[PDB]
């Protein structure tokens, strides 16, 4: 079948195109496909440092003091409340410089983001409430794991669900 | 109400189109056994109703297609639209 | 994958145009198991549900390698004649065994001298290599002598 298959593939005029695809593609400086370097390079902070052949405008020099400041914030889950603007702004500048942008976030982004956030969480908790009672109760972790087994399209996988399946402790401990 | 609804499923006056055997198989597949007959007929009924809903979606979306005011066929455009209007995902078939 | 040409694309599907279906599926048998016997003591019978030497016709990359009258019967397709299979060690072990068995000197210590080898072969591993030699030996013992109460008693206890 293999020989006959190759012969029939040669029956098509694309035998020439098939003959040319012998090299190693990605004719670039490279596209690594390993794992550990993806991880590391996706773990260290980057820095948007710029060239200046003739003129690279922007009128505001690039800094990486911002990235350190961003990674140092008392982010959520330590504190007990959703972050107020200032914390979120400090974290964003870090991410924007860390991805390769420049210029300061303009104080409307934070608010629309908070808005979308609280909408998200109201949806989730409405789901859990729809689980526990049909029509004086009090809610637990297991109900939220149940509803994130039923509806997983809500949350993006990674990070937290694995962490969620490592917090379900037994009674005595 | 609700209690009439399990007053009624027991006797032959309301026996879903989905036969008892097939629903027993599908109960067993997804892992449920019980020596009641009501509940199985009930899941039968809800599924019957859901498919009826996509049926009417298909009927109306076929009725829009031409001449509002060689017989009928529920094709892939009608289905593409109704399944889409649900949460059922995109049907992008092809050729070549 | 029907063909179609344009002035080729090799695509069409002409499996449609149904109006009514009223067919019934037929149920197969349940999953039940068929035991047999295979490979008694190394040899593979071909009489019951087994193959004959037809894997010489198989594709040689696949299924590779092949090494392998009366009430006095104990096995013919096993070839116990050649005395190379047992071991160099096992012949001497068997000699020690038989010699400690057929001792028959006193009534105070000889039974104590053999009883622990008796109770050894009672419980010890890997003896399925030297069984038929043991069987032929003991049948030789019974057909050679009839008078000694001692030997027949020891053999009854050996079969226990």
């Amino acid at each position: 079948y293999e020989r006959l298959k190759r012969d029939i593939l040669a029956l098509p005029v694309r035998e020439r195109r098939r003959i040319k695809a012998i090299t190693r593609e990605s004719g670039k400086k490279g596209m690594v496909n390993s794992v550990i370097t993806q991880t590391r390079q996706a773990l260290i902070p980057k820095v948007p440092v710029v060239t200046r052949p003739t003129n690279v405008p922007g009128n505001s020099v690039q800094w990486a003091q911002d990235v350190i400041h961003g990674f140092q914030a008392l982010l959520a889950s330590e504190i007990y409340e959703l972050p107020e603007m200032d914390n979120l702004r400090t974290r964003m500048t870090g991410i924007s410089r860390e991805h390769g942008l420049i210029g300061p976030v303009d104080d409307s982004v934070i608010e629309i983001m908070l808005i979308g956030l609280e909408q998200h969480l109201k949806g989730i908790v409405e789901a859990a409430i729809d689980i526990v009672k049909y029509r004086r109760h009090t809610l637990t972790i297991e109900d939220m794991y149940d509803t994130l087994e039923q509806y997983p399209y809500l949350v993006e996988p990674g990070g937290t669900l694995l962490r969620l399946q490592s917090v379900m402790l037994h009674d005595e401990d | 109400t609700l209690e009439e609804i399990l007053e009624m499923m027991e006797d032959e006056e309301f026996t879903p189109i989905i036969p008892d055997a097939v629903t027993d198989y599908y109960l067993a597949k997804n892992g449920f056994e019980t020596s009641d007959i009501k509940i199985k007929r009930i899941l039968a009924l809800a599924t019957q109703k859901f498919i009826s809903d996509i049926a009417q979606d298909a009927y109306e979306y076929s009725r829009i297609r031409s001449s509002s005011s060689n017989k009928v066929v529920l094709t892939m455009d009608d289905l593409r639209s109704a399944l889409g209007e649900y949460g059922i995902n995109v049907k992008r078939p092809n050729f070549y | 994958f029907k063909e179609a040409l344009v002035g080729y694309v090799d695509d069409d599907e002409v499996d449609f145009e149904k109006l009514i279906n009223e067919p019934l599926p037929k149920v197969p048998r349940f999953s039940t198991f068929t035991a047999h016997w295979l490979a008694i003591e190394g040899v593979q019978p071909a009489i019951p549900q087994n193959p004959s030497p037809n894997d010489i016709k198989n594709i040689l990359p696949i299924n590779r390698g092949s090494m392998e009258i009366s009430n006095q019967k104990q096995g013919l397709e096993v070839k116990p004649l050649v005395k190379h299979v047992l071991s160099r060690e096992l012949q001497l072990y068997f000699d020690k065994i038989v010699e400690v068995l057929l001792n028959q000197e006193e009534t105070k210590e000889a039974e104590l001298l053999r009883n622990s080898a008796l109770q050894s072969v009672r419980a010890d591993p890997g003896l399925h290599q030297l069984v038929p030699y043991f069987i032929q030996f003991i049948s030789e013992t019974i057909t050679k002598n009839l008078k000694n109460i001692s030997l027949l008693s020891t053999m009854l206890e050996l079969i226990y």
């Binding site: 794992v35 996988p157 490592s166 | 009641d36 995109v90 992008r92 092809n94 | -």
Partner: protein, 123 residues
């Protein structure tokens, strides 16, 4: 497609059922349609749409496709083995001691009210 059989040959799987090539080709068509659709949206986005502000002209460079694919794999397509996450997470679990007890030759079950008691379900 015969080339799909040729691609099957790379993984030593010459035992197909002939529905797979139809199915996987259908799949790739669906996938790339969605991909180069939202990439076209992003090409519009660089072209500064609303209820009439400018035109819509297509180039579709590789960067837009890269954007349209990274969003998909944001919630799909089993990624690189996330080892470090799992290592630290499991160290957090692998922290509190074993029970160090003796049920004395049986089975020790969870307490009833956590056990199931698989009776005939009934109202």
């Amino acid at each position: 497609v015969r080339l799909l059989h040729l691609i099957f040959a790379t993984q030593n799987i010459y035992s197909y059922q002939d529905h797979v090539p139809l199915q996987l080709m259908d799949f790739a068509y669906r996938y790339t349609t969605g991909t180069l659709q939202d990439a076209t949206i992003y090409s519009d986005h660089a072209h500064a749409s609303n209820a009439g502000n400018a035109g819509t002209n297509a180039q579709l460079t590789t960067e837009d496709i890269r954007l349209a694919i990274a969003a998909r794999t944001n919630y799909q397509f089993k990624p690189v083995p996330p080892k470090e996450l799992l290592l630290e997470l499991a160290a957090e679990r692998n922290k509190k001691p074993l029970p160090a007890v003796i049920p004395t030759w049986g089975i020790r079950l969870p307490p009833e009210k956590y056990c199931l008691t698989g009776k005939d379900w009934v109202l």
